[PDB]
Each structure stands twice: as structure tokens, then as C-alpha cells.
Design an enzyme around this catalytic site. Structure first.
Site, short mmCIF file in Angstrom:
data_model
loop_
_atom_site.label_atom_id
_atom_site.label_comp_id
_atom_site.label_asym_id
_atom_site.label_seq_id
_atom_site.Cartn_x
_atom_site.Cartn_y
_atom_site.Cartn_z
N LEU A 93 -5.36 -2.63 5.46
CA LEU A 93 -3.78 -2.93 4.79
C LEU A 93 -2.94 -1.97 5.23
O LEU A 93 -3.16 -0.76 5.17
CB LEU A 93 -4.14 -3.08 3.30
CG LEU A 93 -4.50 -1.84 2.62
CD1 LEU A 93 -3.49 -1.10 1.90
CD2 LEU A 93 -5.50 -2.41 1.53
N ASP B 214 -11.29 7.20 -11.63
CA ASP B 214 -10.54 8.37 -10.89
C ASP B 214 -10.73 9.65 -11.46
O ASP B 214 -10.95 9.74 -12.60
CB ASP B 214 -9.34 8.02 -10.40
CG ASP B 214 -8.64 8.85 -9.11
OD1 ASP B 214 -9.47 10.01 -8.99
OD2 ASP B 214 -8.07 8.41 -8.07
N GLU C 193 -11.33 -0.90 4.62
CA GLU C 193 -9.74 -1.59 4.62
C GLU C 193 -9.08 -1.70 5.73
O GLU C 193 -9.50 -1.00 6.58
CB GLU C 193 -9.00 -0.88 3.55
CG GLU C 193 -8.82 0.72 3.84
CD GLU C 193 -8.01 1.08 4.84
OE1 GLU C 193 -7.03 0.26 4.89
OE2 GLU C 193 -7.74 2.34 5.28
N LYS D 200 -13.41 0.44 12.19
CA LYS D 200 -12.18 0.93 11.62
C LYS D 200 -11.51 2.10 12.43
O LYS D 200 -10.21 1.94 12.51
CB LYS D 200 -12.56 1.43 9.98
CG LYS D 200 -11.47 2.20 9.40
CD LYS D 200 -10.32 1.12 9.48
CE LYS D 200 -9.01 1.87 8.35
NZ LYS D 200 -7.80 0.99 8.71
N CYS E 255 -3.06 7.97 8.95
CA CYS E 255 -4.14 7.38 9.49
C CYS E 255 -4.43 7.44 11.05
O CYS E 255 -5.49 7.77 11.66
CB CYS E 255 -4.07 5.96 9.16
SG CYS E 255 -4.04 5.50 7.43
#
Ligand SMILES: [Cl-]
Ligand SMILES: [Cl-]
Ligand SMILES: [Cl-]
Lengths: 460, 165, 459
Positions: free
Chosen positions: A163, A36, A161, A220, A276
Site C-alpha cells: 500500500l 503494540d 504489504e 517485496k 521505503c
């Protein structure tokens, strides 16, 4: 067939961190390196105290860190060594320009694509793990093709992803499905099967789905939209319940027992929050506008408008009940997080409800058991906060001389309060506005005590 | 099409009644009839209006699923994505499920449009214009899907179809 | 490669005159004009032609029998041809997606399928009629889908630019010849082949070669630019009436700017004809279909302004007659869309009359060239029976009328005995000049007793 031995992930967010920590834990033969650009995050992952909290994460990480799991600021080398490169950087919504407040900003993804090709040679699989707009992988392919080298073969995959922040580890160890998208070509299929092989270490092949690159990207966005739509739908029903005498919890239950519909994500609320749902739906809408699909765009826009409506409606009921004047009135706000059992306030419905009441000049006393004080002040700024916002250390300090109690987060503790006590020191008429249906079953108690109680999806 | 099976083994039986002593007796009487072959776990009791509303909302939720995947189908044609792939990926989320996610030229039948239109009107009559136009989108998307499909055919035939078999 | 045999499908006012001229300047080429309508063909082979154009009779008689042929044997004429002109009219759709604006390609599609079925080897297929853009793609697709071994069909665009009335002169000395073709080796060959045909009598400087889509688009835009000029000066005319300015003066001053030119700047009650509105509307639809709404509404303004100009003119009459026209006799002078023709297609006279008919006026219509029955047809959907009378002479139309309305710039209207007309007109007597034909006569007419109003002049 090609086997993956070294994995580099760019981005130690709530996506890349837990995902790669789990992979290292289930694939001891593979060397997974998480990098990162923020030195703060890196030092935190290698610290006894992690930068994000997930159940079972601390254990999983400590099991692998040093053997096949590494956190470093040395991105170039981790790219140089990697067979597989996860791109796991966040794509923030644009805050200016064409698509302001809706479109995703690809600046961080574009940077990673240029950084990879710069530091890489030979065969490498480049997989986008983060939520991207559709046809984004075309942008990555274009950067790779334009900056090709002799003996450079970069393959682009999509592996999003799924989760939920709070049950990350369980979701990773036992996912409903793993999604992998790739080019419908020989080279592309090999790259897919390589990534597919990694997950086969602990994920049954029945639960691994392979699609083309764009179906994966789109899946997604659409999945989160379908979820958000469920909430907005039951919320719309809740408003129709208040007008008919029906009860939304009863209706939700009746709907949810239809196996084709299911009983998940049918709990009415003051409005959904999180980093999200709104972000991805807004991104979906913009995409449709850009592709001249105005009918589809305004179809999905309804999910957002209904959520805004739900919040505004809830705020307006409070104000009407207080005779359309709230100036200098003390009001208790219980719960600030976007959902219970977290300190996350991102897009929390508490923010808007509070802000609506602030536009009326209310004296807000806000309490949240987990959310840090400084976060509340930040989320309520652009001066206005100083005059109107008081932050209570305990719930009772907030209901001492208050006109109304507004519950904006479904914290379990709010259900167990001494409401006999609260009522004694409240001004009359004393109101409770339940925005989370947490006091369902307590109504008759509170009424005989002396409260006027109103809640989502139940006629007053 | 599957009436008998649905009746003999229903997901749930819905009974709504007045929240009064006499009303509760009437509910339990009807409840008792279904207990002959329906497990009590699968018998749900609500007030009268929740029961009425549940029938309308359930069909609307179903119809919304179809219109949603249909909207995705149009976005698929514009991106290169594939709606059957996307539907599958969405449907494997247990919270969403894999039923009623098959894209089509548009849904039909004597119940879906009829009940959604009825739901919309109810909201208008009750001064709930935001909710009304929310659910109206389910119908418009279905109309869009059909018109879109027809228009593609016509364009492919060079915008002239006169006397063409 | 040289072009030796030419087949033209369609004996309209496009294909007919064009091919007759080609035959006259290309004695070595066998030009065969065909049509499925046996009526048309025999007229071409007759001492009396099916359409009237100055000098056409001469050109035809020079070639008819030697290298110019009119036949119903289409299949054979296609088989023999090196070049096949598609020259059928493309009517506006009257129903369905694009009603009243979009072009119907049915006649073009039929021709394309007829060609490929009856042809082998190398052939150049050229569209001559005004077509919508990407039409040649439709022709190409039929050719590609219905291929044969050793079939090499080349598709070209070569649009007409002849004004109905001076066709032959426009053909002999055109401003430019337009040919569009694919930007490929084979395609350029087909273009230079056709380019060569026109070089027989057209200088190469005035032959322009473009790709196929540029050619199709150029024909539509050219008419639109022209129509825009009229609508622009017409818009100015309304601003003149409101300011005291005069549109004929302003038009002149503008037109002396070399960059603007002085053609198509004559204000009127509104433009007419079978090409201007049709092509602009077709252009607008095309923009909508291609998600270009800004461009679509930009060009739509040309139509709205023309509609405005007509409606504005009609309202002035009605207002001047105290907003009641019921059972009032009104003379309508001129019905054709322009002077010196019998053509009434999209004539502004039609709308002006219709506006006045919706007021219950008694219209007495006179036009020196336009046939009586055509007027009756152009004014229907019962209403015609009650309100419309057709006058044999102008004075029969102005006998006991409240107003004289001039809707066509016929030269004879300038020379009428307005002294006689006024005596037997009802008072107050009005003249509405919609074509500026009485410019210079105003002071005269006023002293007789007329109130005279005209386009682009304050009252
Ligand atoms: Cl570095
Ligand atoms: Cl204030
Ligand atoms: Cl024939």
C-alpha cells in the site's frame, strides 16, 4: 480445511493498522486484535483521533472497533487466543556493526518470534507482513524449532504489504494483487489456503498469488527496487536532456506510451524520497554482497547513486548560478516534504538540497504548508541550524530579499503564486530553480517578468 | 516479427521538429499523413532532440527490465526463491506491468545492446560519466548473465569440457 | 576384509615405483600396472626401465613375473582388482576457466568411467596422483550416476610424497603414509583395508587416516608450506643485501629454533621443479573459486616472491653491465632446476636466461647433465638462433665473456680454475653467484680481479 476466527497483529504501524482494520471490516466473523508495545499508539487508535491519517481510515475503523476490531497493549493474551499472528513490526536499517547503513536489523522480528512461541500452544499460523530481508522466515522457523513444545505446530507464512502511504484504504480494498508465500509442504499449503481464504472475502481469486516463502520475501524488495529504478532512469535521462536540448517530460511521455513500459513512475524530479525506496534497495544490495553476488549488488546500487547524483547536481547548479558563493545569501526553499500533500519528510530530497546549501553557509528560509516546524529543525540537525535556517510562516516572507527560489516539493499551491509580486522584492539576478516541473507552461511568463528560470530536464 | 500490426495499430507515432513556424508546418504535414489511419490521440509531437532521444531511451528502458529480472534470477538461485514467481508478483503491479519480465540466458537482437552502447558513449562525450555508467550496468548484467550460465555448465562438468559432446 | 589383487592405471613416476615397492613387501598380492601407452609397458618389461631411480631396478627384478605385472590389458586388470590405483598425471589447463592454474581432470574422469564400466561387486578406488580438492567427489558422482546392481565402489585418497631422484628410499621409509576416506561404516572399512596393505612394511604410527578432503588438501598445502619457506628466506636475502646482513648466517640462526627446523632454508635465485609452482597456483585458484580472496592472495605471495627473486637477480647483472647487454658474451653455468639432475622443469635458469636474452645477450650455456636439445626447446616460444650458444665445457662458455652467472648449485662449479677463466674474460669481469656455491672463496676471487656478487650478501 482450517478456518481463521481470531487474528492477532503485532505492530500498529502504517502497515498493520490499516490492513487489519480493513480485514475486520470485510470479515465480520473474524476477531481481529491489533497490539503494540507502545501504549501511546494503542490509546490513539481507540481514541476519536487516530495516530496516522489515511483517507477513509477513520470511517472503516469506527465501523468495526468494538465488534471484531480491538486495539490493546495485552500482547500475550492476543497471541494466546489467535489462530493467525501477523508480525508487522518495522525492520530499521542497522546504524552500526556489520552492514551499517544498509543491512536490515532483525532485532524486532526476532523478539516477536520468541514472544509468540513463549505465549502460544497448538496450531497457529505466523505470517510476516512487514518488509523483511530474504531467508528471514528461516530465522523464525529456527527459533520455533529450537523452542518446540509437545502439541506446538507453528506455521510460517509470508504476506507482504503493497500500500502506498496516502491511498492505503483504496489499495487494501481493491489491491492489484495479494501475495502469500508458504512452505511447499502439506502443512504449509494448508496454512497458505487459510490465509488465502481470509482475503477471498473481498479479493477475487484471480488477484491472489501463491509462491514459496522466499519468492514472496524477495518480491517485496524487488518490486520497490523496480519502481525506484524507473525514477532513477528517467532522472538520468533528465540530465542528458539538459545537455542536448531535449526535454525530459516530452521523452518520458514518448517512452510511457509504450504499453510494455507504461506511463507510471516516469516523472523526473530532484530525487525520490520516502521511508521505503532507498531503505529497501540498500537492503537488497547488502543481501547480494553477503551472498557473493557483487555484480548484482553493484547493478542495483546504481539506483541509489543516480538518486544521489540527481540531488547533488541540482544543488551544484544553484551554487554555480550564484557564482559559487552563497555565504549570507537569502534563499527561499519552497516545500520540505518528500512528496506533495503530506507532512512526511523521511528521506525528503528537500533535506539534502537544504543541507548542501547549508554547507555553503546560506541563509535558508524554508516554507512548507503542512510540515510541522519542529520536524524541519530535527531533520537538519546531527547549532548549524540557528545561524542559517529561518522558517517562514508564509511563502512571501521567504522570498523577501532572496537571491533564488528553490522548489523541492510538487505542492499544487506553488504554481498559483503571484510571481510578479515575488520578483519585485527579490535581489537581481533573481533565480527560480524548479525541481519538480510544476511551473511547466509558465516559463515565458516568468522570463518576461524578469526571472531566470531553470528546471529538471530542460536545457537552460 | 509483428511489423505490420505494429504499423497499422501503433501504441504511438513520434514526430520531432524545430520549434519554429516553418518547422511546425513540416511537422503537421507529416502528422497529417499518419492521421489517415492513426488516431490523433496517439500522435506525439516533440522538439527534434526529444524525438531522437526517446528512441534510444525507450529501448534502454526495455533492456533494463530484462537485465533487472535477470539480476533477480541470480539472487533467486542463491536464496531458493523462484524468478518466474517473483516476476509474476512484480508484474501484477500496474505501475510496473508484466511485459519484458521473463528471465533468460541474456537478451539479444540488433537493437538493444547497440542502442544502449550508443547511449552510454553519448553520455561520455557530454561529460556525463554518472549517467554513462548507470546505463552501462544494463550491458554488464547481460554479459554477467551469459558468463554465469556458461560457468555453471563447466563447473557441473568438473571444470573440464575437452572433447566432451 | 583383505586386499588380494591390485590394479594401477598409469605407469608414470608415481604409480610405477609405488606399486613395484608394494609388490616387494606384499608377496601375496598380485599387482598389475597398466597404461594405454604400449611404449611404456614394454620398457618396464625390459632390462632397461623407462625411468631411473636408485634401487628401482633391483626392486622390480625381484617381483616382475611373480606378483608384479605390466600390461596393456586394462579392462581385465580392473575386473580382477580389489583395489584400483588411479595414477595418471593431472596437467594444468592451457585454456578456458582457470587457464595456467587450474588442474585438468580429463584423464582422471576417463579412468573413473573406465573403472565403473569394467567392474562389478566390491572395489576400492584410490587416487594416487596429485589432484585438486573435491576431485574424489567427481569420481564418486560418476560411480553414483553409472551404478549397477551389487556394485559397491569405495573411493579413497592416498597421495604420493616421493621426491624425483630418491623415490625408492622415500617409499621404504616414509615420513608418513596418508589415506583419506569417507567417514562412514563402509568407508572406514576401505580405509583400514588399504591401511593394512602399508602395515606390511610401514609402522602404524606413521600411517595417518583422515577424511577424503583432508587428504587431497594435505598434498597441496604440504608443498606450499615448503615453497613458502624458500620464498621467505629468499625475501630475507634481499633484505640482507640492503642491510649488510648475510642470509646464510640468518638462515642458520633461524633454523636452530626447534620449532622452525633447518630444512628448506637455503636461499637461491628461485625454486623450480614440476610440483612447487604448479601446486601453489592450483591452491590459489581453488581459493578464488571458493570465494576466499584473502587466502588466495596470501598464498599468491609465495609465487610473486619467487618471481621477484629471479627478476631482481637478472636486473643486478644488467645494471652491473651498465644496463646494456647487447652482443655481450655471458656464461650461464647450470641449467637444471637443482643440482644432480637433468630436469629443467621450471628451472630458474630458464627465466634468468630469458631476461638476458631480452637484452640481446650472447649466452653460452653449460650444464654437465642437461641434454643440449632440451635447452633449445626451453628457450623458445628465432630468438634462440641468434643469441644462444651451447658450450661443451665451462671454459668454452667463459672465453671472452663479460660475466659468469651460476644458476645451479653444481658441486663442480666450486672447483673451477678461475685464474684461467679471468685471463680470457673481458674486463671488468663479473661473477654472479645465485646459489652461494662460492661462499668462502670470495677473498680469493677478488684478488684475482673478479667482482663477485651473490644472493643475500651486500656487495
Ligand atoms: Cl502483555
Ligand atoms: Cl557554515
Ligand atoms: Cl583394455
Amino acid at each position: 480445511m482450517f478456518e481463521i476466527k481470531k487474528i492477532c497483529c503485532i505492530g500498529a504501524g502504517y502497515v498493520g493498522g490499516p490492513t487489519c482494520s480493513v480485514i475486520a471490516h470485510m470479515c465480520p466473523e473474524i476477531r481481529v486484535t491489533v497490539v503494540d508495545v507502545n501504549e501511546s499508539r494503542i490509546n490513539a487508535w481507540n481514541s476519536p483521533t487516530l495516530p496516522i491519517y489515511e483517507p477513509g481510515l477513520k470511517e472503516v475503523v469506527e465501523s468495526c472497533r468494538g465488534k471484531n476490531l480491538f486495539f490493546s497493549t495485552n500482547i500475550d493474551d492476543a497471541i494466546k487466543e489467535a489462530d493467525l499472528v501477523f508480525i508487522s513490526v518495522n525492520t530499521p536499517t542497522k546504524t552500526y556493526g556489520m552492514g551499517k547503513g544498509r543491512a536490515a536489523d532483525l532485532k524486532y522480528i526476532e523478539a516477536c518470534a520468541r514472544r509468540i512461541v513463549q505465549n502460544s500452544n497448538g496450531y497457529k499460523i505466523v505470517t510476516e507482513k512487514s518488509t523483511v530481508p530474504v531467508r528471514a522466515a528461516e530465522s523464525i522457523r529456527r527459533i520455533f524449532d529450537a523452542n518446540t513444545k509437545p502439541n506446538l505446530n507453528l506455521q510460517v507464512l509470508s504476506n507482504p504489504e503493497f500500500l502506498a502511504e496516502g491511498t492505503a484504504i483504496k489499495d487494501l480494498k481493491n489491491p492489484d494483487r495479494v501475495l502469500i508465500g508458504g512452505d511447499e509442504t502439506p502443512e504449509g499449503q494448508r496454512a497458505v489456503q487459510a490465509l488465502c481464504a481470509v482475503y477471498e472475502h473481498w479479493v477475487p481469486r484471480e488477484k491472489i498469488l501463491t509462491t514459496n516463502t522466499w519468492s514472496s520475501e524477495l518480491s517485496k524488495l524487488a518490486a520497490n527496487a523496480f519502481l525506484a529504478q524507473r525514477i532513477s532512469s528517467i532522472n538520468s535521462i533528465s540530465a542528458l536532456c539538459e545537455a542536448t536540448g531535449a526535454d525530459v517530460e516530452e521523452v518520458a511521455t514518448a517512452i510511457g506510451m509504450d504499453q510494455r513500459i507504461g506511463n507510471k513512475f516516469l516523472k523526473a524530479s530532484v530525487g525520490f524520497g520516502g521511508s521505503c525506496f532507498q531503505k529497501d534497495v540498500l537492503n537488497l544490495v547488502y543481501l547480494c554482497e553477503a551472498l557473493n553476488l557483487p555484480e548484482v549488488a553493484r547493478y542495483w546500487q546504481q539506483v541509489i547513486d543516480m538518486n544521489d547524483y540527481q540531488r547533488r547536481r541540482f544543488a551544484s547548479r544553484i551554487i554555480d548560478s550564484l557564482f559559487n558563493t552563497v555565504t549570507d545569501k537569502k534563499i527561499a526553499i519552497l516545500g520540505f516534504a518528500f512528496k506533495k500533500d503530506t507532512g512526511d519528510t523521511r528521506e525528503s530530497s528537500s533535506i539534502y538540497i537544504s543541507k548542501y546549501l547549508m554547507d555553503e553557509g546560506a541563509h535558508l528560509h524554508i516554507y512548507d504548508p503542512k510540515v510541522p516546524r519542529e520536524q524541519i529543525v530535527v531533520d537538519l540537525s546531527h547549532d548549524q541550524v540557528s545561524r542559517l535556517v529561518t522558517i517562514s510562516k508564509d511563502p512571501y516572507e521567504a522570498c523577501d530579499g532572496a537571491h533564488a527560489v528553490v522548489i523541492c516539493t510538487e505542492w499544487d499551491m506553488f504554481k498559483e503564486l503571484d510571481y510578479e509580486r515575488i520578483h519585485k522584492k527579490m535581489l537581481k539576478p533573481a533565480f527560480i530553480f524548479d525541481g519538480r516541473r510544476v511551473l511547466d507552461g509558465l516559463h515565458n511568463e516568468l522570463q518576461t517578468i524578469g526571472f531566470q528560470i531553470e528546471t529538471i530536464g530542460k536545457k537552460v
